[PDB]
Ligand binder design. Structure first.
Ligand SMILES: *Cc1c(COP(=O)(O)O)cnc(C)c1O
Ligand SMILES: *Cc1c(COP(=O)(O)O)cnc(C)c1O
Lengths: 367, 370
């Protein structure tokens, strides 16, 4: 009861009231609340199409499937990301081409993308990491020059702006509504795209391949089941209404960590030089034993003993058994250095000033 | 619309809302203790060893077949007379569905039809427990055993179904659905029961990113790529309430179904036949066959006229092999009992919040439209 986790959702009477309305309606799976959430994300991003899905992982699965990616194709991706993207690429039969990230913001650079392009490349998947945007214009420019789509992993970037627009204003991006995300419906995701044909395929492939060949709907080609229930969509709508205030509070907390950890050896990520608004999904520090007098793993342990949770976002995929053995030649020095040294300290909007003080005090004590 | 009688509606009330409140207050909203409790509850319900909650029965099928190693070059025997999810999952693993016909009066596959379709390439048999009645699973299983072929049961319709005095899935492997129209619901969700330890271990990893502990105790990592089909605790809590309600809900469904059986006996509409083997019917759907020669009206027109009278109906199911992808990929498939029924069935309103007057309304309209 005194434990301070690294994240907790902000669920209250508004969420319970939205659930009451869905239960009372009798329409609990995909329905009007899905449609409302999708319209809301078009209004948020300014992009044309929004497709709600059961998870961002499922969203990535069907987006890559709808693009036709399969055996013989390469997909450029960081290793420094969640394993879902790599797994989906593999489970479509395609080959992930893992590239290194910037050592201080953990995001892929246009130069590293261009160097990895081959005649087999069929997609590039940058990650907007921790709530900051990647330099998406420059990455998009590389893709355009070679005719390669860019699919943005925007799980961390609900409320992120880049050069004055919300992430995903154009192109294709995938958001997550998992429990630790800045807006949550326990599990859920949503794809935005400006590509009409892609949006039509995705919508079918997330609901059994059903489509019209006006004849009744039937399986046009096999698809998966990744639709989002209206129970969950209703929660997501409440949490999107809260997102601006939630991100404001996250930014206040993150600002205080940046300031009060500046005279500690723990090293936050660097803020990108391009114009942006950070959503502050995670507050990551690097723990370099030679600088801090403590290792990353030991810091996490001792914080836990003090009642303070931490997360590891992420253990680089290429270091994990399946990828380590399948892709033994992959050597990504910035990724490997950071992967061994990062952790996420508590950041969520229901944190009080005293919770933040407890974290800062503990880090000063352990340095 | 306020007077519309749909063919199904969930029974959501204060108990469900109080379960949701508890989960939200706890702050643990995705997979957690409610999942574990739901799984334990399904082991106690069925008597089987392992229970794995998933985000849908479709995802359950996907990961179950995947964990069995089903892939290119393997044949999977399945009815066409079922939901398209099973056929789609077979295909999307690269395997080949072998569609067989069903009994003309209960719409379930027979042991004879299974045996006739077995080849050296067959790697699974997927019977469907249809509308709330069980298939003759001992006989189907015996065919599987004789040839060394696993039987994976589609039990989406069979929460509360008994066979020979035990709940469906008491042994073997079976997959339940908690979709909105199923007898217990958490809007979307499912659950796998299995008696196979290794299969259960593989499934648990493949529905959550392939994560596992490597042999030779380290932290979790990707052992082999997996999917994301875990069930949130918000949903698991709803399912727990609906399972607590399932005995009473199924009793009410049986009362309605018995009344339909009796009061449609003097109409030309033809319910499914009740299997001869011993069972307890869950009464997920009340299906009628509408043959224009006998009834004076076609299935499609009956559904349209009922809708005009404020009465909803469903079509469970348009046989998979008649749908574009399968008709064009598998044009050679010819399944006379399936094709005859698929063109003639519909599901009339059956859900436990129906009142006696709702049931009278349906019976009266069917009598009018004969
Ligand atoms: C968790 C995560 C995903 C997958 O999201 P789900 O909603 O859990 O499927 C994808 N990308 C990143 C960066 C993530 O953190
Ligand atoms: C409900 C249904 C399914 C799939 O169920 P979901 O939980 O919606 O994925 C599979 N088989 C049958 C026979 C069904 O009725």
């Amino acid at each position: 009861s005194d434990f301070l986790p690294f994240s907790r959702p902000s669920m209250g009477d508004a969420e319970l009231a939205a659930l009451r309305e869905v239960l009372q309606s009798g329409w609990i799976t995909t329905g009007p609340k899905n449609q409302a959430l999708e319209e809301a994300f078009c209004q948020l991003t300014g992009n044309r199409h929004a497709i709600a899905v059961s998870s961002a992982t499922g969203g990535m699965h069907v987006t890559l499937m709808a693009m036709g990616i399969g055996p013989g194709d390469e997909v450029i991706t960081p290793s420094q990301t969640w394993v879902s993207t790599l797994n989906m690429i593999c489970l479509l039969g395609a080959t992930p081409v893992m590239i290194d990230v910037d050592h201080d913001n953990l995001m892929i650079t246009p130069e590293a993308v261009e160097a990895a392009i081959t005649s087999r490349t069929k997609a590039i998947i940058p990650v907007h990491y921790a709530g900051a945007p990647a330099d998406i214009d420059a990455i998009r420019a590389v893709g355009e020059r070679h005719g390669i789509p860019v699919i943005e992993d925007a799980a961390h970037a609900a409320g992120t702006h880049y050069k004055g627009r919300h992430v995903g204003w154009r192109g294709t991006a995938i958001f997550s509504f998992h429990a630790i995300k800045n807006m949550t419906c326990a599990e859920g995701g949503l794809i935005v795209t400006d590509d009409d044909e892609l949006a039509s395929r995705i919508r079918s492939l997330k609901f059994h391949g059903l489509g019209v060949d006006a004849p009744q709907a039937e399986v046009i080609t096999p698809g998966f089941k990744y639709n989002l229930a209206d129970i969950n969509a209703a929660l997501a709508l409440v949490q999107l209404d809260k997102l601006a205030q939630a991100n404001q509070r996250r930014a206040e907390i993150a600002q205080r960590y940046l300031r009060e950890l500046a005279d500690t050896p723990f090293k936050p990520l660097t803020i990108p030089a391009w114009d942006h608004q950070h959503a502050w999904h995670l507050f990551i520090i690097r723990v370099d034993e030679a600088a801090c007098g403590i290792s990353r793993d030991v810091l996490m342990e001792k914080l836990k003993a003090m009642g303070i949770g931490t997360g590891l976002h992420f253990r680089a995929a290429h270091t994990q058994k399946y990828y380590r053995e399948r892709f033994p030649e992959v050597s990504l020095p910035n990724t490997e250095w950071n992967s061994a040294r990062i952790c996420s300290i508590p950041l969520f909007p229901d944190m009080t000033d005293d919770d933040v003080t407890r974290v800062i005090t503990a880090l000063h004590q352990l340095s």
